[PDB]
């Protein structure tokens, strides 16, 4: 890498990242074609700005298309790039796409624990509790250990919705991981058991 | 402390008073299967409850039979394979499923008589 | 006494093999002859739904 190439990449990546943060996926596409005209090869961080720009404007199809451009260019997506797509999929309730992206990160040899934690919280936040339980249990049964904050989140939200079957499954997996249930978790299960008519 | 490097080797510098015909017995112990008896007691020293140890061994033995059906039931028993694997997991060495055979058998058709 | 010895060892699956159900299904019919019904219900610990076992 010469000094002239480094100088151009700085001003090209300055313009590109100032439009990704501006939530302008169209502008981020123009700069990439400016890089191609100059002969500069867009790296993983240039397509990251394209994914983020689409992701910030709630655009799941364009962000997935941007990922295909990155893969089609032979570049390796950053771990943060996949997390932006995983978090976007959860916000739209697309658990199937969120799980497909997690499989890609495992294929890319990344660490999917943090991205799996993000996917479950997005589904819970966006009132997709049924989808969140499916994703959470698959990760928990797969061997991943969730955060204590997320364990308390999943148990409590299921019991507020009257879903004792999922809340009991999670609490069993929580102890199998090595986190013992406390009075808080039992009080969540009892909130549903007390209404079943069988004392 | 640091001297150049030359250093003082630590030695006992104090007196500790605490510092051959079993071949037939040793070979008979292996023949009767007493080695696995000591291994079972060794494994149970690492177990809090012996009833969950029995269940876990049976659960692991069931997985072996589903995975490879035809290799078990004769000279290799699944439960013996589980116990030998768990001893090897501790870092010690045991033959697979504790299976041993008589090398002095005078050919096919001959059964050793007790 | 053999059942007691097996229970003392805690060999629950050995005891189940040596007992096996026809012994209990036949008991239900004889109780039915006295105008008594003996129903076996399983309550699910997950969703609290009651299942009547086929006896």
């Amino acid at each position: 890498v010469s000094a002239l190439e480094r100088s151009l990449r700085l001003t090209f990546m300055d313009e590109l990242m100032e439009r990704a943060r501006n939530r302008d996926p169209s502008g981020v596409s123009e700069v990439i074609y400016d890089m191609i005209a100059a002969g500069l090869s867009p790296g993983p961080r240039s397509f990251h700005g394209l994914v983020v720009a689409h992701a910030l404007n709630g655009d799941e199809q364009g962000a997935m298309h941007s990922l295909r451009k990155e893969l089609g260019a032979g570049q390796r997506p950053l771990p943060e790039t996949m997390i932006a797509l995983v978090r976007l999929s959860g916000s739209k309730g697309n658990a199937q796409r969120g799980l497909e992206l997690l499989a890609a990160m495992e294929k890319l040899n990344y660490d999917i624990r943090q991205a799996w934690l993000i996917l479950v919280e997005e589904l819970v936040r966006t009132n997709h509790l049924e989808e969140a339980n499916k994703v959470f249990l698959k990760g928990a049964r797969g061997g991943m250990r969730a955060t204590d904050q997320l364990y308390d989140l999943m148990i409590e939200e299921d019991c507020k919705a009257g879903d004792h079957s999922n809340a009991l499954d999670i609490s069993y997996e929580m102890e199998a991981a090595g986190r013992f249930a406390t009075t808080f978790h039992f009080n969540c299960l009892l909130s549903v058991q007390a209404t079943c008519g069988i004392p | 402390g640091i001297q150049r490097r030359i250093w003082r080797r630590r030695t006992l510098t104090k007196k500790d008073d605490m510092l051959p015909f079993v071949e037939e017995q040793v070979r008979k112990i292996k023949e009767v299967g007493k080695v696995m008896t000591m291994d079972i007691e060794r494994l149970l020293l690492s177990e809090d409850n012996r009833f969950e140890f029995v269940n876990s061994v049976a659960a692991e033995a069931t997985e072996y039979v589903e995975k490879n059906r035809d290799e078990y039931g004769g000279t290799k028993k699944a439960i013996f394979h589980v116990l030998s694997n768990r001893v090897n997991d501790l870092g010690f060495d045991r033959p697979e499923a504790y299976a041993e055979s008589d090398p002095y058998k005078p050919g096919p058709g001959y059964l050793k008589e007790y | 006494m053999e059942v007691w010895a097996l229970e003392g060892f805690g060999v629950a699956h050995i005891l189940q093999e040596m007992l096996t159900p026809e012994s209990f299904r036949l008991l239900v019919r004889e109780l039915r002859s006295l105008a008594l019904e003996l129903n076996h219900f399983l309550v699910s610990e997950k969703n609290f739904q009651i299942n009547r076992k086929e006896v």
């Binding site: 990922l67 295909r68 893969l71 089609g72 260019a73 032979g74 497909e100 992206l101 499989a103 890609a104 294929k107 890319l108 | 009833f51 029995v54 269940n55 | 229970e7 060892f9 805690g10 060999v11 629950a12 699956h13």
Partner: peptide, 17 residues
């Protein structure tokens, strides 16, 4: 005893080269 206590992305998206 032993009865106590119940006993594909990244595919078809490669570089054309």
């Amino acid at each position: 005893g032993t009865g106590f206590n119940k006993g594909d992305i990244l595919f078809y998206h490669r570089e054309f080269c």
